[PDB]
Specification:
The complex is a heterotrimer of chains A (9), B (99) and C (263). Helix content of chain A is 0%, strand content 0%. Chain A has no helices and no strands. Chain B has 99 residues and is mainly beta. Helices cover 0% and strands 47% of the residues of chain B. In chain B, strands 1, 2, 5, 6 and 7 form a five-stranded antiparallel sheet that branches. A four-stranded antiparallel sheet of chain B has the order 4-3-8-9, with no helix packed on it. Chain B is elongated and about 45 Å long. Chain C is 24% helix and 38% strand. In chain C, the strands form three sheets. In chain C, strands 4-3-2-1-5-6-7-8 form an eight-stranded antiparallel sheet. In chain C, helix 3 runs parallel beside helix 4. The chains are: A little secondary structure (9), B mainly beta (99), C alpha+beta (263). Chains in contact: A-C, B-C. Chains B and C meet through strand 1, strand 2 and strand 6 of B and strand 1, strand 3, strand 5 and strand 13 of C. The PDB classes it as immune system/agonist.
Chain lengths: 9, 99, 263
Protein backbone atom coordinates (compact mmCIF):
# COMPACT_ATOMS: atom_id res chain seq x y z
CA UNK A 1 0.00 0.00 0.00
CA UNK A 2 2.17 2.87 -1.36
CA UNK A 3 2.40 5.96 0.85
CA UNK A 4 1.10 9.36 -0.28
CA UNK A 5 3.23 12.28 0.78
CA UNK A 6 1.88 15.39 2.40
CA UNK A 7 3.43 18.87 2.30
CA UNK A 8 6.17 19.33 -0.29
CA UNK A 9 9.74 19.93 0.72
CA UNK B 1 28.80 14.21 -4.86
CA UNK B 2 30.16 11.12 -6.60
CA UNK B 3 30.27 7.59 -5.07
CA UNK B 4 32.53 5.05 -6.74
CA UNK B 5 31.06 1.70 -7.97
CA UNK B 6 32.27 -1.50 -6.31
CA UNK B 7 32.42 -4.34 -8.86
CA UNK B 8 32.49 -8.14 -8.63
CA UNK B 9 32.47 -10.53 -11.54
CA UNK B 10 31.58 -14.18 -11.10
CA UNK B 11 29.57 -17.07 -12.52
CA UNK B 12 26.14 -18.14 -11.26
CA UNK B 13 27.17 -21.82 -11.26
CA UNK B 14 30.57 -23.42 -10.73
CA UNK B 15 32.57 -22.90 -13.94
CA UNK B 16 33.36 -25.99 -16.03
CA UNK B 17 34.99 -25.56 -19.44
CA UNK B 18 32.62 -26.31 -22.36
CA UNK B 19 29.42 -26.14 -20.23
CA UNK B 20 27.09 -23.14 -20.71
CA UNK B 21 26.64 -20.86 -17.70
CA UNK B 22 25.75 -17.23 -16.74
CA UNK B 23 28.31 -14.49 -16.15
CA UNK B 24 27.47 -11.84 -13.50
CA UNK B 25 28.74 -8.31 -13.01
CA UNK B 26 27.44 -6.91 -9.76
CA UNK B 27 27.95 -3.18 -9.37
CA UNK B 28 27.10 -1.48 -6.06
CA UNK B 29 27.74 1.57 -3.82
CA UNK B 30 27.43 4.12 -6.66
CA UNK B 31 25.93 7.61 -6.96
CA UNK B 32 24.56 9.11 -9.26
CA UNK B 33 22.41 6.21 -10.56
CA UNK B 34 23.43 6.77 -14.19
CA UNK B 35 25.95 4.08 -15.08
CA UNK B 36 27.42 2.36 -18.20
CA UNK B 37 28.34 -1.28 -17.93
CA UNK B 38 29.83 -3.52 -20.61
CA UNK B 39 30.86 -7.15 -20.32
CA UNK B 40 33.88 -8.27 -22.34
CA UNK B 41 35.16 -11.41 -23.97
CA UNK B 42 38.82 -10.99 -25.03
CA UNK B 43 38.50 -7.21 -24.72
CA UNK B 44 35.48 -7.03 -27.06
CA UNK B 45 31.95 -6.07 -25.95
CA UNK B 46 29.49 -8.93 -25.60
CA UNK B 47 26.46 -7.43 -27.42
CA UNK B 48 23.53 -9.21 -25.69
CA UNK B 49 23.96 -8.05 -22.09
CA UNK B 50 20.95 -8.06 -19.75
CA UNK B 51 20.56 -5.62 -16.90
CA UNK B 52 18.51 -5.91 -13.74
CA UNK B 53 16.22 -3.04 -12.88
CA UNK B 54 17.89 -0.39 -10.81
CA UNK B 55 17.61 -0.24 -7.07
CA UNK B 56 19.21 1.32 -4.10
CA UNK B 57 20.21 0.21 -0.62
CA UNK B 58 19.52 1.55 2.88
CA UNK B 59 22.65 3.75 2.70
CA UNK B 60 21.02 5.40 -0.38
CA UNK B 61 23.65 4.07 -2.78
CA UNK B 62 22.48 2.39 -6.03
CA UNK B 63 23.22 -1.13 -7.32
CA UNK B 64 22.69 -3.28 -10.35
CA UNK B 65 23.40 -6.83 -11.50
CA UNK B 66 24.52 -7.20 -15.17
CA UNK B 67 24.52 -10.67 -16.71
CA UNK B 68 24.96 -12.54 -20.02
CA UNK B 69 25.17 -16.18 -21.10
CA UNK B 70 28.64 -17.48 -21.76
CA UNK B 71 30.63 -20.72 -21.85
CA UNK B 72 33.95 -20.61 -19.99
CA UNK B 73 36.98 -22.06 -21.76
CA UNK B 74 40.59 -22.70 -20.65
CA UNK B 75 41.88 -19.76 -22.65
CA UNK B 76 39.24 -17.01 -23.03
CA UNK B 77 39.08 -14.23 -20.44
CA UNK B 78 35.97 -12.34 -19.47
CA UNK B 79 35.76 -8.94 -17.88
CA UNK B 80 33.37 -6.28 -16.70
CA UNK B 81 34.02 -2.65 -17.60
CA UNK B 82 32.08 0.11 -15.81
CA UNK B 83 31.99 3.73 -17.00
CA UNK B 84 30.63 6.26 -14.43
CA UNK B 85 31.01 9.99 -13.42
CA UNK B 86 33.03 9.28 -10.22
CA UNK B 87 35.87 7.88 -12.35
CA UNK B 88 37.89 9.69 -15.01
CA UNK B 89 38.37 6.39 -16.88
CA UNK B 90 36.46 3.09 -17.16
CA UNK B 91 37.19 0.47 -14.49
CA UNK B 92 37.80 -3.13 -15.61
CA UNK B 93 37.54 -6.17 -13.37
CA UNK B 94 38.59 -9.53 -14.88
CA UNK B 95 36.75 -12.79 -14.16
CA UNK B 96 38.73 -15.17 -11.99
CA UNK B 97 37.23 -18.67 -12.21
CA UNK B 98 38.34 -19.37 -8.64
CA UNK B 99 36.79 -16.20 -7.08
CA UNK C 1 9.61 -14.56 12.69
CA UNK C 2 9.59 -10.77 12.22
CA UNK C 3 8.27 -8.95 9.11
CA UNK C 4 8.61 -5.67 7.20
CA UNK C 5 7.33 -3.53 4.32
CA UNK C 6 9.25 -0.76 2.50
CA UNK C 7 8.72 1.61 -0.35
CA UNK C 8 11.95 2.94 -1.93
CA UNK C 9 11.16 5.90 -4.23
CA UNK C 10 13.62 7.71 -6.58
CA UNK C 11 13.28 10.87 -8.67
CA UNK C 12 16.02 12.08 -11.01
CA UNK C 13 16.10 15.37 -12.88
CA UNK C 14 18.51 15.82 -15.78
CA UNK C 15 19.25 18.90 -17.93
CA UNK C 16 18.13 17.43 -21.24
CA UNK C 17 15.10 15.82 -19.61
CA UNK C 18 11.89 17.74 -18.98
CA UNK C 19 9.96 15.96 -16.21
CA UNK C 20 11.79 13.84 -13.63
CA UNK C 21 12.09 10.13 -14.14
CA UNK C 22 10.37 8.60 -11.08
CA UNK C 23 10.77 4.96 -9.88
CA UNK C 24 9.05 3.34 -6.89
CA UNK C 25 9.90 -0.13 -5.67
CA UNK C 26 7.86 -1.90 -3.01
CA UNK C 27 9.28 -4.71 -0.80
CA UNK C 28 7.73 -7.22 1.68
CA UNK C 29 10.22 -8.95 4.00
CA UNK C 30 13.01 -7.40 1.93
CA UNK C 31 11.82 -8.96 -1.35
CA UNK C 32 10.54 -6.86 -4.24
CA UNK C 33 6.75 -7.19 -4.74
CA UNK C 34 5.61 -4.17 -6.83
CA UNK C 35 7.16 -1.59 -9.10
CA UNK C 36 6.29 1.66 -10.90
CA UNK C 37 8.53 3.42 -13.47
CA UNK C 38 7.38 6.60 -15.22
CA UNK C 39 9.59 5.78 -18.18
CA UNK C 40 7.20 2.89 -18.98
CA UNK C 41 5.04 3.38 -22.09
CA UNK C 42 1.87 3.08 -19.96
CA UNK C 43 3.20 3.87 -16.46
CA UNK C 44 1.64 1.82 -13.66
CA UNK C 45 2.38 -0.33 -10.64
CA UNK C 46 3.06 -3.92 -11.87
CA UNK C 47 3.26 -7.04 -9.65
CA UNK C 48 6.77 -8.34 -9.03
CA UNK C 49 5.90 -11.58 -7.19
CA UNK C 50 3.31 -14.16 -8.37
CA UNK C 51 1.32 -13.90 -5.12
CA UNK C 52 0.38 -10.25 -5.93
CA UNK C 53 -1.47 -11.24 -9.11
CA UNK C 54 -4.27 -12.12 -6.63
CA UNK C 55 -4.91 -8.34 -6.29
CA UNK C 56 -7.70 -7.07 -8.57
CA UNK C 57 -7.69 -4.16 -11.04
CA UNK C 58 -9.04 -1.61 -8.49
CA UNK C 59 -5.94 -2.20 -6.32
CA UNK C 60 -3.60 -1.51 -9.26
CA UNK C 61 -5.60 1.53 -10.38
CA UNK C 62 -5.48 3.27 -7.01
CA UNK C 63 -1.78 2.43 -6.49
CA UNK C 64 -0.98 3.83 -9.95
CA UNK C 65 -2.74 7.09 -9.02
CA UNK C 66 -0.84 7.40 -5.72
CA UNK C 67 2.37 7.01 -7.75
CA UNK C 68 1.32 9.86 -10.09
CA UNK C 69 0.72 11.94 -6.96
CA UNK C 70 4.26 11.06 -5.78
CA UNK C 71 5.52 12.11 -9.22
CA UNK C 72 4.00 15.57 -8.70
CA UNK C 73 5.40 15.75 -5.17
CA UNK C 74 8.97 14.77 -6.11
CA UNK C 75 8.99 17.18 -9.09
CA UNK C 76 7.86 20.14 -7.06
CA UNK C 77 10.18 19.12 -4.18
CA UNK C 78 13.14 18.90 -6.59
CA UNK C 79 12.29 22.41 -7.84
CA UNK C 80 12.18 23.75 -4.28
CA UNK C 81 15.48 22.01 -3.29
CA UNK C 82 17.17 23.60 -6.35
CA UNK C 83 16.29 26.98 -4.74
CA UNK C 84 17.23 25.91 -1.18
CA UNK C 85 20.83 25.00 -2.18
CA UNK C 86 21.29 27.86 -4.72
CA UNK C 87 21.98 25.37 -7.46
CA UNK C 88 21.44 26.81 -10.90
CA UNK C 89 19.93 25.25 -14.06
CA UNK C 90 22.05 22.68 -15.95
CA UNK C 91 22.73 19.90 -13.37
CA UNK C 92 21.44 16.43 -12.51
CA UNK C 93 19.72 15.93 -9.15
CA UNK C 94 18.27 13.06 -7.18
CA UNK C 95 15.61 12.90 -4.46
CA UNK C 96 15.02 9.55 -2.69
CA UNK C 97 12.58 8.24 -0.10
CA UNK C 98 12.32 5.17 2.14
CA UNK C 99 9.19 4.48 4.15
CA UNK C 100 7.40 1.56 5.72
CA UNK C 101 6.98 -0.49 8.87
CA UNK C 102 8.65 -3.24 10.89
CA UNK C 103 6.46 -5.82 12.63
CA UNK C 104 7.38 -8.21 15.43
CA UNK C 105 6.92 -11.99 15.24
CA UNK C 106 3.58 -11.26 16.99
CA UNK C 107 2.64 -9.16 13.92
CA UNK C 108 2.52 -5.92 16.00
CA UNK C 109 4.27 -2.71 14.90
CA UNK C 110 7.88 -2.47 16.06
CA UNK C 111 8.88 0.75 14.29
CA UNK C 112 7.87 3.21 11.56
CA UNK C 113 10.40 4.49 9.00
CA UNK C 114 10.33 7.66 6.91
CA UNK C 115 13.56 9.11 5.44
CA UNK C 116 14.59 11.33 2.56
CA UNK C 117 17.94 11.83 0.83
CA UNK C 118 18.95 14.66 -1.54
CA UNK C 119 22.00 14.04 -3.77
CA UNK C 120 22.55 10.66 -2.04
CA UNK C 121 22.78 12.34 1.34
CA UNK C 122 20.41 12.54 4.31
CA UNK C 123 18.10 15.48 3.99
CA UNK C 124 15.29 14.93 6.50
CA UNK C 125 13.98 11.95 8.46
CA UNK C 126 11.06 11.26 10.84
CA UNK C 127 12.34 10.16 14.26
CA UNK C 128 11.25 6.84 15.75
CA UNK C 129 8.66 8.68 17.93
CA UNK C 130 6.89 9.53 14.62
CA UNK C 131 6.44 13.08 16.04
CA UNK C 132 9.72 14.97 15.49
CA UNK C 133 12.05 15.40 12.50
CA UNK C 134 15.84 15.19 12.18
CA UNK C 135 17.35 17.47 9.55
CA UNK C 136 21.10 18.24 9.62
CA UNK C 137 21.60 20.67 6.71
CA UNK C 138 20.93 24.41 7.15
CA UNK C 139 19.02 24.24 3.85
CA UNK C 140 16.95 21.35 5.35
CA UNK C 141 15.70 23.51 8.29
CA UNK C 142 13.34 25.29 5.83
CA UNK C 143 11.66 21.94 5.12
CA UNK C 144 11.62 20.96 8.78
CA UNK C 145 9.82 24.20 9.81
CA UNK C 146 7.42 23.90 6.89
CA UNK C 147 6.53 20.33 7.99
CA UNK C 148 6.30 21.24 11.69
CA UNK C 149 3.91 24.10 10.79
CA UNK C 150 1.67 22.02 8.45
CA UNK C 151 1.48 19.02 10.84
CA UNK C 152 2.83 16.52 8.28
CA UNK C 153 4.22 14.06 10.86
CA UNK C 154 0.73 13.21 12.21
CA UNK C 155 -0.39 12.21 8.73
CA UNK C 156 2.76 10.07 7.99
CA UNK C 157 2.33 8.51 11.46
CA UNK C 158 -1.33 7.61 10.64
CA UNK C 159 -0.16 5.94 7.39
CA UNK C 160 2.66 4.05 9.24
CA UNK C 161 0.65 2.81 12.21
CA UNK C 162 -2.43 2.05 10.04
CA UNK C 163 -2.19 1.34 6.29
CA UNK C 164 1.37 0.02 6.38
CA UNK C 165 0.56 -2.50 9.14
CA UNK C 166 -2.97 -3.26 7.87
CA UNK C 167 -1.86 -3.93 4.31
CA UNK C 168 1.29 -5.76 5.39
CA UNK C 169 -0.94 -8.19 7.33
CA UNK C 170 -2.96 -8.76 4.13
CA UNK C 171 0.22 -9.36 2.03
CA UNK C 172 1.65 -11.83 4.57
CA UNK C 173 -1.61 -13.87 4.52
CA UNK C 174 -1.73 -13.83 0.69
CA UNK C 175 1.93 -14.71 0.05
CA UNK C 176 2.25 -17.58 2.55
CA UNK C 177 10.72 -19.47 3.18
CA UNK C 178 14.52 -19.76 3.50
CA UNK C 179 17.25 -21.59 1.60
CA UNK C 180 20.14 -22.99 3.67
CA UNK C 181 23.67 -22.47 2.34
CA UNK C 182 25.46 -25.44 0.73
CA UNK C 183 29.15 -25.23 1.52
CA UNK C 184 32.32 -26.73 0.05
CA UNK C 185 36.00 -25.90 0.12
CA UNK C 186 38.21 -25.54 -2.95
CA UNK C 187 41.95 -26.15 -3.20
CA UNK C 188 44.19 -23.81 -5.17
CA UNK C 189 48.01 -24.20 -5.21
CA UNK C 190 50.35 -21.20 -4.96
CA UNK C 191 53.81 -20.10 -3.77
CA UNK C 192 51.55 -22.66 0.47
CA UNK C 193 48.00 -23.37 -0.75
CA UNK C 194 44.76 -21.38 -0.82
CA UNK C 195 41.56 -22.81 0.71
CA UNK C 196 38.40 -20.93 -0.22
CA UNK C 197 35.15 -21.77 1.61
CA UNK C 198 32.09 -21.31 -0.59
CA UNK C 199 28.50 -21.03 0.51
CA UNK C 200 26.00 -21.12 -2.35
CA UNK C 201 22.26 -21.22 -2.95
CA UNK C 202 21.22 -19.45 0.31
CA UNK C 203 18.33 -17.06 1.06
CA UNK C 204 18.01 -14.53 2.66
CA UNK C 205 21.42 -12.90 2.15
CA UNK C 206 22.57 -12.62 5.80
CA UNK C 207 25.53 -14.94 6.33
CA UNK C 208 28.91 -15.24 7.97
CA UNK C 209 31.88 -17.40 7.13
CA UNK C 210 34.97 -17.92 9.36
CA UNK C 211 38.13 -19.98 9.40
CA UNK C 212 39.64 -21.69 12.47
CA UNK C 213 40.29 -23.05 17.62
CA UNK C 214 40.58 -19.29 16.97
CA UNK C 215 38.65 -16.90 14.67
CA UNK C 216 41.58 -13.62 5.74
CA UNK C 217 40.16 -12.51 2.37
CA UNK C 218 36.43 -12.57 1.58
CA UNK C 219 33.94 -11.13 -0.92
CA UNK C 220 30.78 -9.22 -0.13
CA UNK C 221 27.62 -11.32 -0.44
CA UNK C 222 26.44 -11.28 -4.06
CA UNK C 223 23.36 -12.41 -5.97
CA UNK C 224 23.55 -15.58 -8.09
CA UNK C 225 20.82 -14.07 -10.26
CA UNK C 226 18.30 -16.81 -9.47
CA UNK C 227 17.07 -15.42 -6.12
CA UNK C 228 19.86 -17.09 -4.12
CA UNK C 229 23.16 -15.62 -2.91
CA UNK C 230 26.85 -16.54 -2.85
CA UNK C 231 29.76 -15.80 -0.55
CA UNK C 232 33.29 -17.06 -0.06
CA UNK C 233 36.02 -16.77 2.53
CA UNK C 234 39.62 -17.90 1.91
CA UNK C 235 42.90 -18.17 3.77
CA UNK C 236 46.66 -18.70 3.14
CA UNK C 237 47.75 -22.16 4.38
CA UNK C 238 51.09 -24.10 4.34
CA UNK C 239 51.09 -27.36 2.33
CA UNK C 240 50.24 -30.77 3.83
CA UNK C 241 48.78 -29.23 7.01
CA UNK C 242 45.35 -28.34 5.57
CA UNK C 243 43.25 -30.69 7.73
CA UNK C 244 44.01 -28.39 10.71
CA UNK C 245 41.90 -25.49 9.31
CA UNK C 246 38.09 -25.37 9.65
CA UNK C 247 35.42 -23.18 8.00
CA UNK C 248 32.18 -22.25 9.80
CA UNK C 249 29.02 -21.11 7.96
CA UNK C 250 26.32 -19.32 9.97
CA UNK C 251 22.88 -18.75 8.43
CA UNK C 252 19.36 -18.22 9.83
CA UNK C 253 17.99 -21.29 7.99
CA UNK C 254 20.60 -23.67 9.47
CA UNK C 255 19.63 -25.87 12.49
CA UNK C 256 23.17 -25.23 13.68
CA UNK C 257 26.34 -23.68 12.18
CA UNK C 258 28.16 -25.72 9.52
CA UNK C 259 31.65 -26.98 10.24
CA UNK C 260 33.63 -28.38 7.28
CA UNK C 261 37.01 -28.46 5.50
CA UNK C 262 39.02 -29.47 2.38
CA UNK C 263 38.61 -33.14 1.40
Amino acid sequence: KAPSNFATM
Amino acid sequence: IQKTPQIQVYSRHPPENGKPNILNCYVTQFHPPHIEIQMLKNGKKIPKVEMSDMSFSKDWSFYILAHTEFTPTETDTYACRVKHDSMAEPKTVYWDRDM
Amino acid sequence: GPHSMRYFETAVSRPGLEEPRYISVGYVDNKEFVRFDSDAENPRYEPRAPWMEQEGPEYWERETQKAKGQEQWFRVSLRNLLGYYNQSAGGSHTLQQMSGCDLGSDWRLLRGYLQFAYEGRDYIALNEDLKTWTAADMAAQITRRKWEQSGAAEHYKAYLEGECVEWLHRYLKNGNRTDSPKAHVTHHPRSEVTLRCWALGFYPADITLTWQGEEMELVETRPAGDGTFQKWASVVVPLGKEQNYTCRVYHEGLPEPLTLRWE
